[PDB]
């Protein structure tokens, strides 16, 4: 139950504010409807309805049909629109971090360990760190654009 993490789960764009507010309102209304309603069928007091009705065999026939089965507004799991989009979202957003965020962590560790170290050998290692820092600066401007 991520409360503070679900509000900041999106990126820098504010286009996901309408989709996140509609999903949170639908989940709260569905849980409140199940708690406000009774978690049972019905009483159906046939002991005081069959002997009090004017017509003979009136309340006895209606009590047997209501306690059997009837139709209800329900659906099946055939239209799995959210299940099909879950695999495509993880393969484009979550799977992109396995090659973009992983390459940035390996390049930052190699540049920090080389720029901090004697003369000609240290200058050669600093050249590779300078090239990685220049590429990181261009990637930082592209991430904000």
């Amino acid at each position: 139950l991520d409360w503070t993490k679900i509000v900041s789960k999106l990126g820098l764009s504010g286009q996901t504010a309408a989709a996140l507010t509609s999903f949170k309102k639908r989940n709260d209304e569905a849980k409140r409807i199940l708690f406000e309603l009774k978690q049972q069928p019905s009483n159906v007091d046939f002991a005081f309805y069959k002997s009090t009705l004017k017509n003979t065999a009136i309340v006895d026939k209606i009590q047997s049909d209501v306690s059997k089965f009837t139709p209800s507004k329900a659906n099946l799991s055939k239209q799995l629109n959210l299940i099909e989009s879950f695999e495509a979202k993880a393969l484009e957003n979550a799977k992109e971090t396995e090659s973009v965020v992983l390459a940035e962590l390996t390049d930052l560790e190699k540049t920090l360990e080389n720029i901090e170290s004697x003369x000609x050998x240290x200058x050669x290692x600093x050249x590779x760190x300078x090239x990685x820092x220049x590429x990181x600066x261009x990637x930082x401007x592209x991430x904000x654009x």
Partner: protein, 51 residues
């Protein structure tokens, strides 16, 4: 005048040696401090982007 010019230039070159090294600190030594500050800011920006 040849001996007086050599002694006067020796004292002036001694004071100019300390002034040239001090003036170079605002360009040569300042470049190392500027590169270290730029590398520290780039490392914090790369760690924030990776997080």
């Amino acid at each position: 005048i040849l001996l007086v010019t050599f002694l006067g230039f020796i004292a002036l070159i001694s004071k100019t040696v300390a002034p040239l090294y001090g003036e170079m600190a605002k360009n040569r030594t300042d470049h190392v401090v500027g590169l270290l500050n730029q590398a520290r800011a780039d490392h914090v920006n790369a760690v924030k982007t990776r997080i």
